[PDB]
Design a protein around this ligand. Structure first.
Ligand SMILES: NC(=O)c1ccc[n+]([C@@H]2O[C@H](COP(=O)([O-])OP(=O)(O)OC[C@H]3O[C@@H](n4cnc5c(N)ncnc54)[C@H](OP(=O)(O)O)[C@@H]3O)[C@@H](O)[C@H]2O)c1
Ligand code: SF4
Ligand code: SF4
Ligand code: SF4
Lengths: 313, 176, 138, 206, 111, 106, 147, 111, 372
């Protein structure tokens, strides 16, 4: 097998080259110059951080825990980078018997990275950032499965290969008009660089899964946390975008698929700079109280539609 | 005068209620807020990179201390203990002895950078205009000993900044 | 509108240097810009000016390679440029070698020195007074 | 006068009526000395009852001050009685400023202003820290502007400006930061005092 | 009867005793909860020498003022506040000079 | 209608008249020769006559308050508490306490 | 011989490339420390990225006055830093009290608590002068590990 | 192979930890602290319950997650079975979930 | 915002009792000024606060002006308001930018700091220092306005009107702020008056009171002032009033630009204010008074005085006690920092950890205030 090794090393570079965009686009959004000194346009700085944070930075926590803690950055990468495997792409690595089920299960398993980092420090200061990270993720897992079901019943089955073929004339944004707007919010269930987000950034509280971790484990967390942002951006570009298929020419698909994802890649960092944090209590009131009755009403609506007019795979 | 922050409900009936409900149901005004930083991305940044470009300043500016001298040699400082008394940090120290024969100008002259809040007080209090503040920025040391100025000497080595000082003081006499 | 924007970038690279000159203003220099130059400076500073761009900006200026004895082209600091900081770059409008005359004193240092910081021949503290004298005779 | 005088006195006659109004009540328990100069009023109060004076000026119909915003204390060793707690008061409906003072040595406990004013307790903590004046029936007397293991009171004129314990080295001990080292850099004691009195009328007979 | 302070001359003696009991129970608690530092046995002797220096008893005003001051510096661990092993350490560790000899102090040249 | 403060301006007239009539009786218990009774009464009697003359107009609120009736009611609500405290602690009637040491000049 | 000597400079190039500061909100110096993030005089991804947390950062900037109440606090933060660490004491308060110095509470010069590598003398530390505090830092990192 | 695909990603991830574990080493002093992030000594030593606040909302998720799993047949089951018989039953589970959330509106909790 | 210990007592996650063990930044300005002269003690007031520069010393110099009973020159009075309103452009920006940064907003901090760095150019051109300058003195104003400022202030204010309203289209109209900051720490009763916040809070919600209209300092009531007063004591209305202060601040600056009498910068008395450089070199009396305004400087008339000028955060209650000598023995700067931190016992009752952060920003407890 060569394909897996050709989907980790160039992918870790994409999370590395993200650091440019994380302060270049975000910089111009705030009217400030980002990467400039290090490279021609600061292009040598993202690869410099790998030399900076791993080879020279040494920390291990004080009071600590036993085997757990250092188990958590292994759980961070080894569950978020595996998410690249079930992706349909032009051609998938081992096409699943049911596609999106593996995508939804491993995403919830990726939440454990911020959960086990609560017991990284035995001291109570770190676990407050963990307990906040529970509720900021636990509620949004409800709608994430429901809004999927309304799209999946509209087009094909759980298999991700069928989701490419179903969009031949028009996108799925237009039939699922309120549901597409939900997937700019529901995608930010995992601790991502955003305005909605979770307990990961500083601002008000101490940094979750970062105050306990070093540099080396803490550096490994960013290579997983920012990796999930690309993952949700690609996953939205499958469920809601498509444009064309073309099995004969893979070259025409690969260029067209990347532009659609890159426009969404900018959009989350667009969200991050623009708006403040939603608060621990009031994020639980955005969904559950307000958005859950809306999504279920649309779920009720999407059950009737294949019966009203023929729509069965 | 009263400006009033309270709007007292903008919505009333039919047309005024539905548009206020439309922005809360979906987004609209958040997309309007999204477009606010869109134009901010389009306009050029007002950024200055230091190793090549330099920032704006003023003709009268205070940095690192340097004492001046007359056009035909001689120390301009007369030794008063004046600037010592004005100094709120008491960073400047002065002790004086007669210079061989005739002239009586300084022996000990230390200005500690461990203190000094940069007032321009000693620049203003000096009757002979000895300490004239130049537009200095570059000062970085390994130890405190290297940081604090010795008996004149390094302060006398302000000759490399005295060419700018002579241009700056031309804006000082008959003030601005 | 679009054709003039691409032509402006190509003319900037063609004007300043060429092929090897453009790479020196990209790898070593942070921002690349071409315009008017003052020219005359001690050691070998370029000193460029007369550019619109933005408020409180007077072109690239650029630092010289090996000013006194540092022997560095990649490393540059604010130690560069002679007694001329009060004009062109900041405060004054008149150019230091073109219009504004430097005042002669025959006491000021002829050769400009860079700050050593970590390097030998740097700043030092020294005693001043001879203090109370003590004497003992056999 | 064009630049000589700051402001002409016109409201001073109306402000002098306040100095008579409180004095018309005439308590030896409260009043004592009333001083009024430069558009302001100053009253000093007998130590035995301070709380009944603080309930006055607040609520009262003729003088509705209520807000007892600023709370200072004077350090002076000239008198037989040392410290002097000074209250600064402001009215929002009436628009006037009045001053309340205490005269006692106040090394012995003094009455608290916590039942009258809600923010005064934080200012009361400042006085106990800097001077050493205890307030009777005070809820939670915590240290604010002093170190956790600080001896004495850091503001008193009786002890030096540099302090007894001030210098903190890391030295040979791995984590414990030192305290007992007492030497510091020399503060130049200016012995300057100009001959001839600058002002008339301020001179007192021996 | 001015000023009250807190208690009478005889009652002030038992107010210090009440303060002593609360602080005597805290020296085993300031090792396990805080830091190892020195010792439990040596810690108790450090308490006893502090009260011996303050022992005079002549006015009720002086004694009662020491109680309120004692209900802050020794209350620093009662409700559990941060000292960071730098505070609460009363005895000097890095200070080693204890010379009381006309012969000892004069050789070092002082005063 | 809404008041500026947290206390809501409730539509109640003669409510202000109750509290001012209550405090007049409290003053005539212990102090009579003292000036505290004689000086507070003339302010209250002048204020009570203004309420009787004006029929629920904003001009009645503009008479020595100018922040509606709700702000004036707060001064009357705490008036009973201060009058009872003045009667409890003897200071207005009695004057016999000691004076401080002769020193004032700085 | 030559590969070994250049590899040590490659590790030192990473510290020459980027260093993350600590947001010590200690005094007025911290306001000018916020001006490093301000666009006009920027080190934002020029070599400085603000993130806080003493465990992740490489450089801590002591931005103002330190007292006896703060001496135990700052000391263990420096101990919470990874072993390749640099301290930049910026301002006259950081160098030995702006005024103060002869005061009771203020600890003199930071060096009594935590050792300093680069000194910035400026009270209102002008952002122009502040830029040396990071540029000279990168220049001071020359050689590490010979054997 | 699914097993060979998952293990190769997992083994490469744990190997990167070892690189950051063994290379940087010089000194390990008694310098690392329990709380970090803000500084000072930890007032809350070890572990203490805290709890509450979100106790009702968290419990309801465990109850709701089972129903969404029972909603997963919808796109995959409706292929062979009769639609008219399913329509009454498929909506039935979604209707009752809105009824349970309607009972959640009458006092939601402390959250 | 650093140096605010805030030891929390939580029954779960919400706050029951909040006791801030503050005063960690106690630099000890009180005892330190006692050994300094009035001219020597001047720049301490600037280095008290971190945001306000010309609003500080303003309270201090006026206290010396009330002690000596000597009026500043009419030109200097108009510069003091022009720079008194220019500090409000710095303070109320930090009351928004760092406050939004405390919540989680990244944009607005860098939206206004480019403006703020342009704002310090006005400080640099008027006095040799960047931030804190001994520009405001008991002799009115130290130095004249240069010719390259009045053209710059007018050019800056003309472009500022659109720049401030860009924050409202970004922050106020959004659902996020109207969801979060609304209904946090609603204190407007007689208890709010029993804490005494002076500037904002009471001004921000409830009582229609300000010193700007009631108690004039240096040529006031002549300049048209607009005071924003809200309805509810919540964090959102306490934020809106500060933004409405910023939109109604340019009116004061524009009126200060139009109304300028050409004349004197310092007072004619050489006993209080130092003479000109050309003046001292020729005439005798000027140089001796220049010599004597240092060492033992001003010579203050004895008597206790208390002055307060409305800060953008609250009030500077400077209380100077005077002797025969030119050393002021003890003074207390009664900044609102002590008043705002005292309110946290009531503000944090029944609130989460995340919005306690928002309380600090809306109160704007810049810890430079907390010293005396
Ligand atoms: N085991 C014990 O604790 C013990 C027991 C009994 C007696 N002692 C005595 O106490 C002393 C303890 O010292 P230590 O072992 O703690 O010192 P150390 O840790 O070995 O430190 C010595 C330092 O000197 C430098 N150095 C020494 N020799 C050098 C050379 N030939 N070339 C270049 N640099 C050199 C090293 O620098 P680089 O690292 O840069 O090379 C090193 O940092 C010993 O000398 C021993 O005689 C120790
Ligand atoms: S610097 Fe000026 S004031 Fe100071 S001693 Fe020298 S001549 Fe006198
Ligand atoms: S600028 Fe101020 S602190 Fe510095 S030496 Fe001069 S008088 Fe002293
Ligand atoms: S050095 Fe100056 S600017 Fe910096 S904290 Fe001290 S007083 Fe403030």
């Amino acid at each position: 097998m060569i394909n897996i090794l050709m989907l980790i090393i160039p992918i870790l570079l994409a999370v590395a080259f993200l650091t440019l965009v994380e302060r270049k686009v975000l910089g111009y959004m705030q009217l400030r110059k980002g990467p400039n000194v290090v490279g021609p346009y600061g292009l040598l700085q993202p690869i410099a951080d790998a030399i900076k944070l791993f080879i020279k930075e040494p920390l291990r926590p004080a009071t600590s825990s036993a085997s757990m803690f250092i188990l958590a950055p292994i759980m961070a990468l080894g569950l978020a980078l595996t998410m690249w495997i079930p992706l349909p792409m032009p051609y998938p690595l081992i096409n699943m018997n049911l596609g999106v089920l593996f995508m939804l299960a491993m995403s919830s398993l990726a939440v454990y990275s911020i959960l086990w980092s609560g017991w990284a420090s035995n001291s109570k200061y770190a676990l407050i950032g963990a307990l906040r990270a529970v509720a900021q993720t636990i509620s949004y897992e409800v709608t994430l499965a429901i809004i999927l079901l309304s799209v999946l019943l509209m087009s094909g089955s759980f298999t991700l290969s069928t989701l490419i073929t179903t969009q031949e004339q028009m996108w799925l944004i237009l039939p699922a008009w309120p549901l597409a707007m939900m997937w700019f919010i529901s995608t930010l269930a995992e601790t991502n660089r955003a305005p909605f987000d979770l307990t990961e950034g500083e601002s008000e509280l101490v940094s979750g899964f970062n105050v306990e971790y070093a540099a080396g484990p803490f550096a490994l967390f960013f290579m997983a946390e920012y990796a999930n942002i690309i993952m949700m951006n690609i996953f939205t570009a499958i469920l809601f975008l498509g444009t064309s298929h073309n099995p004969h020419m893979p070259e025409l698909y690969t260029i067209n698929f990347t532009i659609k994802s890159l426009l969404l890649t900018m959009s989350f960092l667009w969200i991050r700079a623009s708006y403040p944090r939603f608060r621990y209590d009031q994020l639980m009131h955005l969904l559950w109280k307000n958005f859950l009755p809306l999504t279920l009403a649309l779920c009720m609506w999407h059950v009737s539609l294949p019966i009203l007019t023929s729509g069965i795979p | 005068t009263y400006k009033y922050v309270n709007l007292r409900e903008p919505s009333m009936d039919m047309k005024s209620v539905t548009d206020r409900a439309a922005q809360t149901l979906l987004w609209t005004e958040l997309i309007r807020g999204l477009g606010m930083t869109l134009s901010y991305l389009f306009r050029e940044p007002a950024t200055i990179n230091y190793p090549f470009e330099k920032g704006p300043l003023s003709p009268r500016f205070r940095g690192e201390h340097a004492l001046r001298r007359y056009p035909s040699g001689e120390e301009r400082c007369i030794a008063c203990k004046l600037c010592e008394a004005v100094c709120p940090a008491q960073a400047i120290t002065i002790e004086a002895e007669p210079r061989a024969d005739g002239s009586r100008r300084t022996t000990r002259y230390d200005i500690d950078m461990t203190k000094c809040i940069y007032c321009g007080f000693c620049q203003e209090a000096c009757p002979v205009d000895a300490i004239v503040e130049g537009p200095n920025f570059e000062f970085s040391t390994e130890t405190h000993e290297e940081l604090l100025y010795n008996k004149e000497k390094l302060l006398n080595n302000g000759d490399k900044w005295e060419a700018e000082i002579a241009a700056n003081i031309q804006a000082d006499y008959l003030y601005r | 509108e679009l054709l003039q924007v691409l032509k402006r970038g190509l003319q900037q690279v063609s004007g300043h240097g060429g092929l090897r000159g453009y790479l020196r203003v990209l790898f070593r220099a942070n921002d690349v810009r071409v315009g008017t130059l003052v020219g005359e400076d001690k050691y070998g500073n370029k000193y460029y000016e007369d550019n619109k761009q933005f408020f409180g900006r007077h072109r690239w200026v650029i630092y010289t390679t090996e000013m006194n004895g540092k022997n560095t082209f990649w490393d540059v600091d604010g130690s560069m440029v002679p007694p001329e900081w009060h004009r062109w770059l900041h405060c004054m409008t008149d150019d230091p070698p073109t219009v504004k005359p430097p005042t002669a004193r025959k006491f000021i240092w002829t050769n400009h020195k860079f700050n050593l910081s970590g390097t030998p021949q740097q700043y030092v503290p020294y005693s001043t007074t001879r203090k109370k004298i003590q004497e003992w005779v056999p | 006068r064009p630049t000589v005088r700051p402001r002409n006195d016109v409201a001073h006659k109306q402000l002098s009526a306040f100095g008579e109004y409180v004095a018309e009540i005439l308590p030896k328990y409260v009043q004592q000395v009333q001083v009024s100069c430069f558009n302001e009023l100053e009253i000093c109060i007998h130590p035995d009852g301070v709380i009944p004076v603080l309930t006055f000026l607040r609520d009262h119909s003729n003088a509705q001050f209520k807000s007892l915003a600023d709370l200072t204390a004077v350090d002076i060793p000239t008198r037989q009685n040392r410290f002097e707690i000074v209250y600064n008061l402001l009215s929002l409906r009436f628009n006037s400023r009045i001053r309340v003072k205490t005269y006692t040595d106040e090394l012995t406990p003094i009455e608290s202003s916590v039942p009258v004013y809600k923010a005064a307790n934080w200012y009361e903590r400042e006085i106990w820290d800097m001077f050493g004046v205890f307030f009777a029936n005070h809820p939670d007397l915590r240290r604010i502007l002093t170190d956790y293991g600080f001896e004495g009171h850091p503001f008193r004129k009786d002890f030096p400006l540099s302090g007894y314990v001030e210098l903190r080295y890391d030295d040979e001990v791995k984590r414990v930061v030192a305290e007992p080292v007492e030497l510091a850099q020399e503060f130049r004691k200016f012995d300057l005092n100009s001959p001839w009195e600058a002002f008339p009328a301020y001179r007192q007979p021996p | 009867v001015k000023p009250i302070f807190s208690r009478d001359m005889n009652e002030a003696k038992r107010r210090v005793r009440e303060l002593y009991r609360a602080w005597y129970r805290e020296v085993p608690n300031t090792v396990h909860l805080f830091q190892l530092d020195i010792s439990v046995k040596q810690g108790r002797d450090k308490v006893r020498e502090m009260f011996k220096k303050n022992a005079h008893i002549t006015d009720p005003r002086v004694v009662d003022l020491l109680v309120i001051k004692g209900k802050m510096e020794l209350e620093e661990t009662i409700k559990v506040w941060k000292q960071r092993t730098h505070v609460m350490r009363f005895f000097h560790e890095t200070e080693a000079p204890r010379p009381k000899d006309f012969l000892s102090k004069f050789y070092v040249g002082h005063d | 209608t809404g008041l500026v403060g947290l206390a809501v301006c409730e539509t109640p007239h003669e409510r202000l008249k109750i509290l001012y009539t209550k405090i007049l009786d409290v003053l005539g218990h212990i102090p009579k020769n003292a000036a505290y009774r004689k000086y507070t009464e003339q302010i209250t009697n002048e204020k009570l006559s203004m309420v009787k003359a004006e029929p629920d107009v904003k001009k009645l609120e503009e008479r020595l308050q100018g922040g509606q009736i709700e702000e004036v009611i707060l001064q009357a609500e705490n008036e009973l508490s201060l009058a009872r405290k003045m009667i409890q602690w003897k200071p207005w009637e009695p004057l016999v306490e000691e004076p401080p040491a002769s020193q004032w000049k700085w | 011989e030559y590969v070994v000597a250049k590899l040590d400079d490659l590790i030192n190039w990473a510290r020459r490339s980027s260093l993350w500061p600590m947001t010590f909100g200690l005094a007025c110096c911290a306001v000018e420390m916020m001006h490093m993030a301000a666009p006009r005089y920027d080190m934002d991804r020029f070599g400085v990225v603000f993130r806080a947390s003493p465990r992740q950062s490489d450089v801590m900037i002591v931005a103002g006055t330190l007292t006896n109440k703060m001496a135990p606090a700052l000391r263990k933060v420096y101990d919470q830093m990874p072993e390749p660490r640099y301290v930049v004491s910026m301002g006259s308060c950081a160098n030995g009290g702006g005024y103060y110095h002869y005061s009771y509470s203020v600890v003199r010069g930071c060096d009594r608590i935590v050792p300093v590598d680069i000194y910035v003398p400026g009270c209102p530390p002008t952002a122009e002068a502040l830029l040396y505090g990071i540029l000279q830092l990168q220049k001071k990192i020359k050689r590490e590990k010979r054997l | 192979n699914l097993m060979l695909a998952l293990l190769t990603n997992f083994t490469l991830a744990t190997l990167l930890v070892i690189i950051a574990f063994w290379l940087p080493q010089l000194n390990v002093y008694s310098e690392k602290t329990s709380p970090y992030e803000c500084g000072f000594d930890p007032m809350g030593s070890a572990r203490l319950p805290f709890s509450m606040k979100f106790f009702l909302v968290a419990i309801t998720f465990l109850l709701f997650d089972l129903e969404i799993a029972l909603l997963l047949p919808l796109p995959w089951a409706s292929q062979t079975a009769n639609l008219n018989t399913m329509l009454t039953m498929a909506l039935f589970l979604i209707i009752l979930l809105a009824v349970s959330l309607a009972y959640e509106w009458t006092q939601k909790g402390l959250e | 915002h650093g140096v605010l210990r805030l030891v929390m007592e939580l029954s779960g996650e919400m706050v029951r009792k909040c006791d801030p063990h503050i005063g960690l930044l106690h630099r000890g300005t009180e005892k330190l000024i006692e050994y300094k002269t009035y001219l020597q003690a001047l720049p301490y007031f600037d280095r008290l606060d971190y945001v306000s520069m010309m609003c500080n010393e303003q309270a201090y110099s006026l206290a010396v002006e009330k002690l000596l009973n000597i009026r500043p020159p009419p030109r200097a009075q108009w510069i003091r308001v022009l720079f008194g309103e220019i500090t409000r452009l710095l303070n109320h920006i930090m009351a928004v930018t760092t406050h939004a940064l405390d919540i989680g907003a990244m944009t607005p901090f860098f939206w206004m700091f480019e403006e703020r760095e342009k704002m310090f150019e006005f400080y640099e051109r008027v006095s040799g220092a960047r931030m804190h300058a001994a520009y405001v003195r008991p002799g009115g104003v130290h130095q004249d306005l240069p010719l390259g400022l009045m053209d710059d202030i007018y050019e800056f204010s003309k472009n500022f009107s659109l720049r401030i309203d860009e924050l409202e289209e970004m922050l106020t109209n959004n659902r996020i702020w109207r969801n979060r900051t609304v209904d946090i720490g609603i204190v407007t009763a007689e208890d709010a008056l029993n804490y005494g916040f002076s500037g904002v809070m009471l001004r921000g919600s409830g009582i229609q009171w300000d010193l700007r209209k009631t108690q004039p300092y240096d040529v006031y009531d002549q300049v048209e002032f607009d005071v924003p007063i809200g309805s509810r004591g919540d964090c959102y209305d306490r934020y809106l009033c500060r933004v409405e202060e910023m939109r109604q601040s340019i009116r004061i600056i524009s009126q200060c630009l139009n109304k300028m009498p050409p004349g004197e910068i310092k007072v004619d008395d050489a006993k209080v204010s130092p003479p000109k450089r050309a003046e001292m070199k020729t005439s005798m009396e000027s140089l001796i008074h220049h010599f004597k305004l240092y060492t033992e400087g001003y010579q203050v008339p004895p008597g206790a005085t208390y002055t307060a000028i409305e800060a953008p955060k609250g009030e500077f209650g400077v209380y100077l006690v005077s002797d025969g000598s030119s050393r002021p023995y003890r003074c207390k700067i009664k900044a609102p920092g002590f008043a705002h931190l005292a309110g946290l016992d009531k503000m944090s009752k029944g609130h989460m950890l995340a919005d306690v952060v928002a309380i600090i920003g809306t109160q704007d407890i810049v810890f430079g205030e907390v010293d005396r």
